[PDB]
């Protein structure tokens, strides 16, 4: 689990 947004 990291940042779940689209980067």
């Amino acid at each position, epitope marked *: 689990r990291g*940042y*779940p*947004g*689209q*980067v």
Partner: antibody
Amino acid sequence: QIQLVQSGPEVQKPGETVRISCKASGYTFTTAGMQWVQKMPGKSLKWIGWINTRSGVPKYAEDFKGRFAFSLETSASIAYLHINNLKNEDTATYFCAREGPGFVYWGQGTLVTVSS
Amino acid sequence: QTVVTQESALTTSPGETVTLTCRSSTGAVTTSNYANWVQEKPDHLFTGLIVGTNNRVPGVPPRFSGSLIEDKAALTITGAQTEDEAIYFCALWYSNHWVFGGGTKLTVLG
């Protein structure tokens, strides 16, 4: 040079709908998510949510998911914010901001005014 | 509750160093809060400065740098310039939502 350019100010009556556009340039539109932010004078910035520009899947803040929806027009590099069944307290400036993580490149803001 | 606090206002002078901080109500800020620093200038001109705690946005001057210090996130401006007079916001990610701090009004003297 990355730019996000939003549509102009809108004034509506309660119960109506508004659509705000956010036109992106200077990068490949579908490689980073687009976030939306609500701001009112002397109140905190509030995160509305994001949309994944590759998959089209949005993620909403709890207080906004009832009436706010995000969409895309991929072929025009446009993200849209749709505010439904407007309330007088939706009166605010709305910003698009590109990921990320978080809020990297910002549109200039769009003032939505809702009458009494 | 997820509340992000910043200093209300700070004053610096040209060429000096100033540190802005961002505190979390839930405990120590970590990498997992993806601290973001954003600058607001007049007429709603917002510019992202730092993402992911310490990653400077391309084209942002290298005098801005992000870190974790003393359970907080920190924006250090090493060699402040007059043009850095602005409101600085920090945003933190709390598992499933972003929260903005209240902003720090930075004044640059002279």
